[PDB]
Amino acid sequence: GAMAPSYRVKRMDIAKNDEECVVNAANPRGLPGDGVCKAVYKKWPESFKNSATPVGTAKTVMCGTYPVIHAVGPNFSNYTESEGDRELAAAYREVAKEVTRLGVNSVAIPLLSTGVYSGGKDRLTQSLNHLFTAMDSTDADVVIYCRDKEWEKKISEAIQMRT
Ligand SMILES: Nc1nc2ccccc2s1
Numbered sequence: 001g002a003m004a005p006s007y008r009v010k011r012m013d014i015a016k017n018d019e020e021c022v023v024n025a026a027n028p029r030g031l032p033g034d035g036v037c038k039a040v041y042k043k044w045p046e047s048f049k050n051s052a053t054p055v056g057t058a059k060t061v062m063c064g065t066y067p068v069i070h071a072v073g074p075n076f077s078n079y080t081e082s083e084g085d086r087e088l089a090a091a092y093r094e095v096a097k098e099v100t101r102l103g104v105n106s107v108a109i110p111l112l113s114t115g116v117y118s119g120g121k122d123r124l125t126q127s128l129n130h131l132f133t134a135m136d137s138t139d140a141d142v143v144i145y146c147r148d149k150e151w152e153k154k155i156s157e158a159i160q161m162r163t
């Protein structure tokens with residue numbers, strides 16, 4: 001584990017992370033996709049061998065020795081708010097199991113279901129709180145990645161609030 005497990009936020013391309021593994025915001029079919037998933041496919045294309053997995057699950061595939069954790073958040077266009085919320089919480093619980101099994105000291109993680117799967121709603125708080133519920137009992141350094149300058153400030157504020 002990390003000597004003093006922390007949460008941090010960075011506003012940059014997750015394909016440039018400085019962590020021991022990466023979480024992909026994957027689709028269920030292991031397709032190249034858009035956004036985070038596209039960047040992950042360009043950086044670690046070998047990790048898409050048999051990466052398909054159901055909604056609310058995570059499947060790890062190694063790119064050399066670098067672990068890519070394919071986490072499938074719900075598309076809120078298709079799920080009810082209630083069922084979507086349950087699957088989004090579950091995807092993060094599966095990421096915490098994988099991070100623990102791999103024995104990494106750090107992980108790069110995006111906010112699941114906040115982009116093209118958001119059903120056009122702002123889900124920063126909902127997604128980040130499910131990330132915390134899952135990751136709080138792990139001892140990896142967690143580095144949350146975002147693109148938007150206002151999201152960076154709100155994520156930073158939420159981390160600092162609980163410290
Ligand atoms: N290349 C990309 N990295 C990230 C990280 C966080 C959010 C969106 C994107 S798109």
Ligand SMILES: [Cl-]
Nearest residue numbers: 011012013016
């Ligand atoms: Cl960047």
Ligand SMILES: [Cl-]
Nearest residue numbers: 114115116117
């Ligand atoms: Cl998304």
Ligand SMILES: [Cl-]
Nearest residue numbers: 146147148151
């Ligand atoms: Cl963002």
